[PDB]
Ligand binder design. Structure first.
Ligand code: 8DG
Ligand code: MG
Ligand code: MG
Ligand code: MG
Length: 129
């Protein structure tokens, strides 16, 4: 079974909204809402990975961010370790840089059912802030 390390960014603005994209229909976890992010490559750190993935996917450089949660989740065909970084300062304005849907969503209104099941404890913990 494939084992992957994934770094994602919880991009939170001053109005308690999170920048959320929707995964492509032919991707793993197709059509799900997601925090922007992706695989940590050989030779790069989890911190470097979340910067690179947010630059690629939504056009921002996260700065002065912190590890909100790290967890492991066994999907039917792969095992993933997810690094959830809380990103409250960044350079740029996030957008659908890869042509993917992206929009600001109120934290209180997030529905964990809309995201991959691995995100359930993170979404709950975020609403506790
Ligand atoms: N990006 C992201 N992925 C998540 C979340 N929750 C979750 O279980 N995943 C899973 C889905 C995928 O198995 C993996 C994310 O990898 P990815 O498809 O974003 O990888 P990538 O950006 O490097 O790949 P690509 O789009 O360049 O093809 O982690 C999340 O909140 N954000
Ligand atoms: Mg990516
Ligand atoms: Mg990605
Ligand atoms: Mg990638």
């Amino acid at each position: 079974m494939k084992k992957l390390q994934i770094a994602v960014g919880i991009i939170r603005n001053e109005n308690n909204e999170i920048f959320i994209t929707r995964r492509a229909a032919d991707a793993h976890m197709a059509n799900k809402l997601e925090f922007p992010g992706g695989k940590i490559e050989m030779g790069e750190t989890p911190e470097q990975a979340v910067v690179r993935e947010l630059q690629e996917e939504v056009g921002i450089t996260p700065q002065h961010f912190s590890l909100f949660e790290k967890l492991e989740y066994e999907f039917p065909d792969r095992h993933i370790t997810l690094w959830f970084w809380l990103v409250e300062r960044w350079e740029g304005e996030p957008w659908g840089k890869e042509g993917q849907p992206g929009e600001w969503m109120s934290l209180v209104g997030l529905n964990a059912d809309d995201f991959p099941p691995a995100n359930e404890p993170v979404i709950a913990k975020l609403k506790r802030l």
